[PDB]
Design a binder for this molecule. Sequence first.
Ligand code: NA
Ligand code: NA
Ligand code: NA
Ligand code: NA
Ligand code: NA
Ligand code: NA
Ligand code: NA
Ligand code: NA
Ligand code: NA
Ligand code: NA
Ligand code: NA
Ligand code: NA
Ligand code: NA
Lengths: 331, 329
Amino acid sequence: HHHVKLSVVEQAPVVEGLTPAHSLQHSIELARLADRLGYERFWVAEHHAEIFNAVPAPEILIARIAAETSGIRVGSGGVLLSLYSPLKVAEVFRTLHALYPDRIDLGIGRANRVKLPVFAALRDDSSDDLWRRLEQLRAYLDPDSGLPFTVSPRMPGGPALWLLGASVSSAEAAARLGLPYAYAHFITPQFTREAMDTYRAAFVPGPDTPSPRPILSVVVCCAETDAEAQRVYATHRLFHRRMSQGDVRLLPPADLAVAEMDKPGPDPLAEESFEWPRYVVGSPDRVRDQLTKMADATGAEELGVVSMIHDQRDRLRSYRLLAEAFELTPR
Amino acid sequence: HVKLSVVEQAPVVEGLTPAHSLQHSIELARLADRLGYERFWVAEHHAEIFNAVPAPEILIARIAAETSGIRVGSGGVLLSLYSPLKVAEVFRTLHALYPDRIDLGIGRANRVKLPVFAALRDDSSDDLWRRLEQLRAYLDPDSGLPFTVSPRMPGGPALWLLGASVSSAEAAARLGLPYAYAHFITPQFTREAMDTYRAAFVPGPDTPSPRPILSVVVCCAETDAEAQRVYATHRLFHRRMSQGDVRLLPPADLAVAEMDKPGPDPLAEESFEWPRYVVGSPDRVRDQLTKMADATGAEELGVVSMIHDQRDRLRSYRLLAEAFELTPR
Ligand code: NA
Ligand code: NA
Ligand code: NA
Ligand code: NA
Ligand code: NA
Ligand code: NA
Ligand code: NA
Ligand code: NA
Ligand code: NA
Ligand code: NA
Ligand code: NA
Ligand code: NA
Ligand code: NA
């Protein structure tokens, strides 16, 4: 059957015992695996001033990862366009497109979760402002738009524009603008169904996009058995306990996390409830079944698979097992 | 001998496309790495059909993966256009991928066209130096900022100031920065600028002594006659620009024919102590460049080229490495 396709969204977490440089190397390794296994695209997220995420400049990792891979699309998931000149962004992604013809995604995301002093420093001198910037970007990417100057480097075609959101409002905007849309279920699981319904219902065809193109971004923690999956997931659980207490540290090791979560204390992930779990955990069959329900309900063509896994060996396993569960054709 | 480096603006040449230019950059960087060039810098040029790279950071990210010994960096990022924090993050990310191999050369945006500049800015000579001090502070994780500059790793990219004025040389001296002077841009002040940099130098972080580079255009071929043929491209490019004729770099043989006809020859109509562009056989170019390096105290020559044909271009850089006795890697 036409299973849902799988893609990777990489925020490059920094894990206890390692450094941001390890995170970057691990991103490359994951991208090469994802390329070989038949994932559709590999996106790199933008995070600023967080010790636990290694990539504030996705465009730099994109430039590298596209050179290390052949078939997978590579791009941003997403560039925080509110922080930048739309012309600068257009130039950067045109340069990527000129290096990696027709392989580059320009996913654009909201800067609403950037800390205020950091935001102010990145700006160096709003809801609707982003959508305006997004129109400006689309215009800079159209070489016939009648601007008084050229957007270098000019080549036929261009990067594929995507809007990333975690709100019903973003889904309305993506619909209005006729953009492909990726919804972060793992960020706002209370509105996933409504957002994806709204995107599809309100969709107005845009330039290269005659029909809705929905992706669902999900955190998945998959291992051979439910018990092993729960062990790998403990890292994430403890990261949430710790963050709820203002304890900001690198992703903790699984075995340590298992021990901690067996003790009394906050468990924000256990204490909340949505239609679908915020983070999807289990054996290959269990995660496949859960994710397929979610994809059917939302009309998602692909799942953008995010992970918060301490150990690279566990992480690569998760993605390998998922490819097999979704019957991906290798490259 | 003086050391040699490459400064790459990625010209777009008649018959080809910007994508060719980028590929040809990579090819040159691999050759330069093998031949023993010290660093490979990528320049930033906006809204010019004849230069392919508005975002040097993207080509740097690729070229550093394609090479192993040569330093790789910007020559230069137009810092007046950007948040110094964003620039710091971008180059910290490069440093995290390519530890201790990255140069962050910073250049002036005074030659960016005004509507383009306005669009890049999205909303003074001294503003740049202020940004430069902000950038240096963001690159110092002990500077007492209320937040961290990701990704944190030991050390950082090497800051360079690129200039084409005596005032830039004064600023570099004042700030204790390594300095690269664009002789090919402002040949009237090369001697004074390089003298001033050295005389006024105040030691800075990690820079106890002046570290001068001279950036030069070179067009080298096996014989003076072949060099002149390759150089005709550049000559014609200048004739055309003086007439408002903006096109890709022309082919050498066509250019030779055109320059034999009456018409503007801006390069012939000017005169400096040293030629704006250095042209000739290996021996001729070596001798000329060595005089210039001796006079300016340059440790290294940043070699720029405006050559139409990639095989002519690679040849120029191969001949130069041999003439300067570079040790291959
Ligand atoms: Na990673
Ligand atoms: Na960060
Ligand atoms: Na960015
Ligand atoms: Na944004
Ligand atoms: Na593309
Ligand atoms: Na991830
Ligand atoms: Na992970
Ligand atoms: Na080139
Ligand atoms: Na340009
Ligand atoms: Na730049
Ligand atoms: Na500047
Ligand atoms: Na050059
Ligand atoms: Na050239």
